A paper describes a structure:
Urease is a nickel (Ni) enzyme that is essential for the colonization of Helicobacter pylori in the human stomach. Ni delivery requires urease to form an activation complex with the urease accessory proteins UreFD and UreG. Combining structural, mutagenesis, and biochemical studies, we show that the formation of the activation complex opens a 100-angstrom-long tunnel, where the Ni ion is delivered through UreFD to the active site of urease.
In [name] urease, each catalytic unit is constituted by the α (KpUreC), β (KpUreB), and γ (KpUreA) domains. One KpUreD (yellow) or HpUreFD is bound to each catalytic unit of KpUreABC or HpUreAB, respectively. The binding sites of KpUreD and HpUreFD on urease are very similar and involve an area of the α domain flanked by the β and γ domains. The surface area buried by [name] on [name] and H. pylori ureases were 2225 and 2384 Å2, respectively. The stretching motion of helix H3 brings Val332 of HpUreB to dock into a hydrophobic pocket of HpUreD formed by Met36, Phe39, Met49, and Leu51. This interaction is also conserved in the KpUreD/urease complex, where Val330 of KpUreC is interacting with Asn42, Phe45, Tyr55, and Leu57 of KpUreD.
Author numbering:
A (entry chain C), F (entry chain K): 2 to 567
B (entry chain D): 11 to 274
C (entry chain E), E (entry chain A), G (entry chain I): 1 to 100
D (entry chain F), H (entry chain B): 1 to 103
The structure:
């Protein structure tokens, strides 16, 4: 038999060669590979394939996957394929064709009695986003990020305190323990960042042994070269990531002194885009070093007409600079220039910037990491056109590069890439299912460790789940023991050795961080560029290979007003 | 092209004190909130979130004082003019005073790096009964390190109008190459005070003594204008502060207490 | 009142539709959530009035035209389901292609 | 500009290529229509349907997966059958085989 | 609709501003929460219309005058920050001294 | 150097001699003492004092406080000072100057790596209010009171039952255990009150061993002299407080018989103001006895035009008197007189009344204990002027007296003053941070056990925490194990000896009540007056020292309509 | 704004009363929750205006007549209690037999 | 009637009374302004600033706490320094001392 390709796309989603436009953007992904056999696809509902003896096998529970996402359009840093996903014991068991091996030709995902089916026909399944710059100001962020498609959050804070309002530092073993205990109530994987602005190594060692997976160096606590050196030495000893938010006052020296203090050791630098500060625009040059992992907060992504006008009050509130105090406005001269903001988007496009963090509720929006990343991708597609290394009339390479900015690169940076980060065998089943019309804006489902954590539910009293009002609600994947079993808490190796998990009675599963101290710029996926970038502090003319870098501000953006009520 | 920045301020009397009625801005020019260290004087700080002014940037500040309003306008830091790539920076300040309005335009010094192609135009429109007390200070180069503004173009134009009549037009134009007007003095300072008398002129001349013979104060059509060239950055600012402190009680009837943004 | 949770959800929908109808009165082009809320509340109010389910299905397709909503919104809304309390109990109203 | 729209290149998709194929004629002797899914073992369908069931052993309907063909009462429909794949072991349906199809 | 939690919070703000504007129409003098809600909703509706952040910053200071609010309220509101979805994404609007 | 006092007040808050007006009232507090050194104050945000090697020391986690509230204006029964507060291990470690002892002159609160900073500049920090008359009708009260600034709630109930609607009694060991288990889910310190209306001591002993910290005698269960005597004997044996709501029917006798039945033993009497009842107005005379601790519910505080009109329906609903039943309205003759209501405010001003409880959701509002206390203080300041023992042109003495009414006096009454009640070293870090414009109405933060419990949060998706809509949300101090570690459950000594905590698996920390049976009227702070008060049952002329006591009803009140939306 | 939970509950009541008054303007006969919400919000708005508790108790009985509500609704509402913030603090208003 | 308003009695607040005091002249040789906080060890400031650093050892800026002085490029600013207190041990900054200032 044979059917029209349009009918096949309607029934099972796009196959090889079909192009899907992401939500109201100019990015057209193309299905590179199909891992199924035509005419043997598994589909659920009524008299369809997935039934007893037809699509569901006779194997026992240990021989079949616990969950199967059917006919998914997997978009990931390793490719854009069409396949089914089999999840077993809360982890991704296999990627390929699902069904009953008894009567189907090539089945690698055996569907049995113990299998629950999630229909992903005509839907895009991506890995859960990872947010590595999160201010733990309120627990309501955890839900919000989860609605946005972010499943792992790495950051510090103790609540709406003065320190948390400015820095992502959970200071002290007591507050680290309290935040670790509170993390059990949030339906997201959580990693804690300590306070690294200390010249005494013993305090940093105590913080790391308390359970933080990384040390944060921030200007507000003092980003002096001595503190940077001490934190880097402690991290080298204890194998944790170091995040640097270098001082914008030039108090202890210029950016050259900070780079010398780093001394070629791996460090994850925020605000590398030079969106205001004493080190701007020279800090952008830091993206050319192999040991520097450059991130970028979302508020300056992408370049828009309204970007500059909102920066001053945001900075003043974030850094506790009261406009009512005359001496405070002396710090309002943030040295923010539109040239660096325009260059940041192009640097993201070229792969010079490897990460897209949030800096949530402190110069950054927690729920707009994926959204603003795809807005930047759309803007770069509109302005610079197709990339040099694109095959065919599709944006597959650019989509892979940008989806790696918030899925796998943050995972590699903080040493959690062995558990989460991408859709691979053995990874935690942190999946986000989008409808293509709502990709990057509003997911159709967020699967957290094999269970649906949050989903758009309609009226509870309705005879079906669809009727209005439809809004996002936490499902059984975010309830007590079920939430504890379907989430991860990341700890340092010393914390796992010290038995912190049982001392605090952490109900959630424990994952140990490893590999932070060896990741380089080359290890970043699709963002390993180390350009010969030059910038003039007088003209702010950012150049790579002698060519100007510029971007025009966006007047209208996709995924902004078509989807959100307010 | 160029990064256009425009700020328009309208002040008026309300509740016995001067209030910022309107602050309409586009681009990188912002005014957050007036301060009231004194009883009714409106202390205002114009913020320039970009530190310096690169070539091609066009700043346009405009101020309008309603009758009976007293305000003190300051910047929380010097205005840096970076070396230009070929495009000139246009700074245009236009200030209008209604009758009985008092204005203290006290900006920080403008530091011109070598090769900075810039053009400044500050004009004051006053009535007969308006009161003005302002200065304009320029630092040509970086004297402490040795840079002496070898190249670049500068055009500092300052005008005063009283009841639609040009009372003072001070022009300082520097061409690319050596500078003869400054005469090895990279600090060019000007002081303006519209209601003035001969006693104020004598007091100012007394205050200009530590600055030497390069400081000259002249009173024409009641307007006192002080022009000086210096090369120390410590005598210059001290003399400007002393003259302002001497003129403040005689003009606004207020204490000479410094604005808090100057860090004492 | 003894408001059950479903009544609170319907109140949230009513507030969203208030936003949508005010924006429509301003002359804007409604987006996806505004259009959905407006049509759903129209159906709910029609049911409260006493219309039949079939009549409401017919009438829900003439609340918003293609020129009253943002481009691409009509294709983003293949159908709108909503539960409403008709005089004969709670019933499900489905409006197919509500924007044409 | 349609958000999330498809651009499917024109053509046809050949289903169940390289598999044993057959044609049968089915008569519905019941009083109600009978719907048979794509992957149902056609030899174990409703006894109301009448055809050569020996020929249909180990075969399913050669139709796109997830679809079902309908036999109206008193009709006669010619359908295409495709052989099973994989281990060729059938369990369930009417329980007429409950094991491998061959040996 | 697929209302995210932030949209629900903004709906709560919209309801509070509805209360505030009805009370203002009644001729009362608004208190602190009423004034804040009214100004925030004005900014949000202006952003939905399509105005720029700078224009909204300028315009938000002329929504409520000193005589329209209770005594001491203007000093209790040094500034009002609000996130609004402009055509170019979500942006922060800060209105300084919104009541004068 | 030297700066103007106005600039110093703007930067660091008021110093010695400066006066701060409480929220829209006529009360002006004055900073009596300053515990800091001028020019060495610690401030956070940007390039400020609290940084590595500048305000933050090199000491280890065991040598530095976990949290520091900086430049706080501490208002408490022991004074109105300006100082920093250092909290260690969830308890107040010190009050004084904070900073780095290495480079600062006089530091008693060492700030180190393990220290989280809360900026309290220009803010008032008070002890968490204590509510000793709470009907546990719904758990939503616990949040509401926490929003109002009350951190400890002592009361009884089993939910919206008939008994709970009228009395604060948790009847029986089963319901006591269930309420103790449910208390772990509420972010407030909780003490349970049993049912004391029993003539058999064994039942009372069983209830006390179940875990209640006090016994409640109520008219609705029968306030007969036999029950009062039995409950007082049991409490004397077992060291628990007895709360009395005397019978208003004069069924078993007049107020003299009740006082004779008490027999000079310590008892905490509700409704002593005589706001309706058979014992009114004579029950007011009970405030003259040393053993009587007189409380007062908030609804009659202060005297207003609308106070009387709302009393009848409130009383009838509270006491389960159905207006639809003809015989029920025979109890509508509550004998409430405006003279006693007017005299209650003046008795509070003179210190004759020591406590201000709530009687929540049964003739009383849970969230208006602090608010109505300060309204009464403002009314007394307006009418009676400055107090006799006021020093300077401030209201410091009156403010201390009224803040002792709901912070320390309730703590002493129920024997929990060794753990909570005031800002002192060793106390639980139950702090409320108010902005002065919102003092007593809406806190800026509620710190519960060293961790922020509830706070006003704006938009979660915002780039900063301030943007609208701002409303109160529970922070990480009210999440699972973090909530359990940052809250206290009070139990009787017998309950602690019996091992009730481990039998019920109480996850929260356990505090043992002591000192209930020895507190007298003299032990009350700033409210130890025992006036020679006389009242005439015919003319209702309340007199102290032969002088008339009267108050005029309030037409308009502060902290009422300027702040609340509805 | 710093909306306390009680203010959020009152906002929910306000939304319910908005629904009720729109339906009343449409000419329908209000049911039990609509009538309760309408009367409660009338009392709340009257208190915000500045009326006394006794005056509001008297006035709340003349908001809805027996012919404006569904049959049996007046007997289902023996009284309506509502907390409202009068200029002198929060007070309880009880309206007995609000529909006659 | 301003809610939560201050009534600050007029006067001056003397800062860092009874401490060793000095005056220095700082020249900013860098191309960008340098902001130095109140409690920063002035002997360990940005090397772009030029002054007698031997004289400034053990001193901080004599300015109100939480403020910072700004040195514009190519300028010359006279600033007031006040000696450290307490144990007089400095740790951090550039790590040029890392211990007690005396002995």
């Amino acid at each position: 038999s044979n059917i029209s390709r349009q009918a096949y796309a309607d029934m099972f989603g796009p196959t090889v060669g079909d192009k899907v436009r992401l939500a109201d953007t100019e990015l057209w992904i193309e299905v590179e590979d199909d891992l199924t056999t035509y005419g043997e696809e598994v589909k659920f509902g009524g008299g369809k394939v997935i039934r007893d003896g037809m699509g569901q096998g006779q194997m026992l529970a240990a021989d079949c996957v616990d969950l199967v996402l059917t006919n998914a359009l997997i978009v990931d840093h390793w490719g854009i394929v069409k396949a089914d996903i089999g999840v077993k014991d809360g982890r991704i068991f296999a990627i390929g064709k699902a069904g009953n091996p008894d009567i189907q030709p090539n089945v690698t995902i055996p569907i049995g009695a113990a299998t629950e089916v999630i229909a992903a026909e005509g839907k895009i399944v991506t890995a859960g986003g990872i947010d590595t710059h999160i201010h733990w100001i309120c627990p309501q962020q955890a839900e919000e990020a989860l609605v946005s498609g972010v499943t792992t959050m790495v950051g510090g804070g103790t609540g709406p305190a003065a320190g948390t309002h400015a820095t992502t530092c959970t200071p002290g073993p007591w507050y680290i323990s309290r935040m670790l205990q509170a993390a059990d109530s949030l339906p997201v994987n959580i990693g804690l960042l300590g306070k690294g602005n200390v010249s005494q190594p013993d305090a940093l060692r105590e913080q790391v042994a308390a359970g933080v997976i990384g040390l944060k160096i921030h200007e507000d606590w003092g980003a002096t070269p001595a503190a940077i050196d001490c934190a880097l030495t402690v991290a080298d000893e204890m194998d944790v990531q170091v995040a640097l938010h270098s001082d914008t006052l030039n108090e202890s020296g210029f950016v050259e002194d900070t780079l010398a203090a780093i001394g070629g050791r791996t460090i994850h630098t925020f605000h590398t885009e030079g969106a205001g500060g004493g080190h701007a625009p020279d800090i952008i040059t830091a993206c050319a070093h192999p040991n520097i992992l450059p991130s970028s907060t979302n508020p300056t992504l992408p370049y828009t007409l309204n970007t500059i006008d909102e920066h001053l009050d945001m900075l003043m509130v974030c850094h506790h600079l009261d406009p009512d105090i005359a001496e405070d406005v002396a710090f309002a001269e943030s040295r923010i220039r539109r040239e660096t903001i325009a260059a940041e988007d192009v640097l993201h496009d070229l792969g010079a910037f490897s990460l897209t963090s949030s800096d949530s509720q402190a110069m950054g929006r927690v729920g707009e990491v994926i959204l603003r990343t795809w807005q930047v991708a759309h803007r770069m597609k509109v302005q610079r056109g197709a990339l040099a290394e694109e095959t065919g009339d599709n944006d597959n390479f650019r989509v892979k590069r940008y989806i790696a900015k918030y899925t796998i690169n943050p995972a590699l940076t903080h040493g959690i890439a062995h558990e989460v980060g991408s859709i691979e065998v053995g990874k935690l089943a942190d999946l986000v299912v989008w409808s293509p019309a709502f990709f990057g804006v509003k997911p159709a489902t967020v699967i957290k460790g094999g269970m649906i954590a949050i989903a758009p539910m309609g009226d509870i009293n309705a005879s079906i789940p669809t009727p209005q009002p439809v809004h996002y609600r936490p499902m059984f994947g975010a309830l007590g023991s079920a939430r504890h079993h379907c989430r991860l808490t990341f700890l340092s190796q010393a914390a796992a050795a010290n038995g912190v998990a049982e001392r605090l009675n952490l109900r959630s599963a424990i994952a140990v961080v490893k590999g932070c101290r060896t990741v380089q710029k080359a290890d970043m996926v699709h963002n390993s560029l180390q350009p010969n970038i030059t910038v003039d502090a007088q003209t702010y003319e950012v150049r790579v290979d002698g060519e100007l870098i510029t971007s025009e501000p966006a007047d209208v953006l996709p995924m902004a007003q078509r989807y959100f009520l307010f | 092209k160029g990064w256009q920045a425009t700020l328009d301020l309208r002040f008026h009397q309300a509740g016995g004190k001067t209030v910022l009625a309107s602050a309409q801005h586009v681009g990188p020019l912002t005014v957050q909130r007036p301060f009231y260290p004194e009883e009714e004087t409106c202390h205002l700080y114009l913020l320039h979130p970009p530190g310096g002014i690169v070539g091609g940037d066009e700043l346009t500040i405009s101020a309008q004082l309603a009758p009976g309003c007293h305000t003190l306008i300051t910047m929380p830091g010097a205005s840096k003019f970076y070396r230009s790539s070929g495009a000139q920076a246009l700074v245009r300040q236009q200030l209008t005073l209604a009758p009985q309005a008092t204005l203290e335009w006290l900006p920080q010094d403008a530091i011109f790096f070598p090769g900075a192609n810039a053009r400044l135009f500050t004009t004051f429109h006053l009535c007969a009964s308006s009161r003005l007390l302002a200065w304009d200070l320029l630092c040509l180069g970086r004297p402490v390190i040795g840079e002496t503004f070898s190249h670049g173009t500068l055009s500092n134009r300052l005008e005063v109008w009283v009841d639609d009549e040009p009372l003072l037009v001070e022009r300082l134009q520097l061409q690319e190459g050596e500078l003869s007007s400054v005469a090895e003095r990279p600090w060019v300072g000007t002081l303006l005070c519209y209601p003035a008398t001969d006693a104020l002129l004598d007091g100012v001349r007394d205050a200009l003594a530590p600055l030497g013979l390069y400081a000259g104060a002249s009173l024409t059509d009641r307007l006192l204008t002080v022009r000086f060239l210096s090369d120390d950055n410590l005598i210059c600012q001290r003399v400007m502060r002393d003259v302002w402190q001497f003129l403040r009680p005689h003009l606004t009837g207020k204490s000479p207490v410094l604005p808090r943004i100057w860090l004492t | 009142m003894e408001l059950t949770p479903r009544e609170k959800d319907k109140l949230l929908l009513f507030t969203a539709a208030l936003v949508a109808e005010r924006r429509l009165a301003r002359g804007l082009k409604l987006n996806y959530p505004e259009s959905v809320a407006l049509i759903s509340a129209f159906i709910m109010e029609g049911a409260r009035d006493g219309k039949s389910v079939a009549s409401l299905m017919e009438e829900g397709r003439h609340v918003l035209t293609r020129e009253q909503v943002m481009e691409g919104v009509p294709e983003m809304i293949p159908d709108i389901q909503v539960e409403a309390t008709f005089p004969d109990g709670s019933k499900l109203v489905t409006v197919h292609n509500p924007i044409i | 500009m349609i958000p999330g729209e498809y651009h499917v290149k024109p053509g046809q998709i050949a289903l169940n290529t390289g598999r044993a194929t057959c044609r049968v004629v089915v008569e519905n002797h019941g009083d109600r229509p009978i719907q048979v899914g794509s992957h149902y073992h056609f030899a174990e369908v409703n006894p109301a349907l009448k055809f050569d069931r020996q020929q249909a052993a180990g075969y399913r309907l050669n139709i796109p997966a997830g679809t079902a063909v309908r036999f109206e009462p008193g009709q006669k429909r010619e359908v295409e059958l495709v052989a099973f794949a994989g281990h060729r072991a059938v369990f369930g349906f009417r329980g007429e085989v409950m094991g491998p199809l061959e040996v």
